């Protein structure tokens, strides 16, 4: 989340947690990391690809629990036109009530 750190460390963190997302269970941690994601998406352009996929896997894990943030995070996608197919599919899967 913190912008001051030398950039490969930032990338490596966003790109590590992705695997933990599918080994462990992160269900209780939605508030600890969604806000840092919605910030760092805006913070600079270099991460707007990799960070968006770090979220995409978290979506795949959490499923229906995630519904509650959709009406909020829809609006973030205007502040910059950040787009990324797998996310864009999965949010629709959630709205139709099937993500199997």
């Amino acid at each position: 989340d913190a912008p001051e750190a030398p950039l490969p460390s930032r990338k490596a963190a966003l790109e590590t947690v992705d695997r933990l997302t599918e080994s462990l269970d992160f269900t209780d941690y939605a508030s600890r990391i969604i806000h840092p994601i919605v910030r760092t998406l805006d913070q600079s352009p270099e991460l707007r690809s990799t960070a968006m996929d770090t979220l995409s896997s978290l979506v795949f894990q959490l499923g229906k629990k995630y519904q509650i943030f959709i009406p909020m995070v829809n609006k973030v996608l205007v502040r910059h036109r950040i787009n990324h197919q797998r996310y864009d599919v999965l949010i629709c899967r959630i709205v139709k009530g099937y993500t199997l």
Partner: peptide, 11 residues
């Protein structure tokens, strides 16, 4: 209670 549990973990 889910909204509470979600709050129960925080920055």
């Amino acid at each position: 209670l889910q909204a509470l549990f979600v709050a129960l973990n925080d920055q």
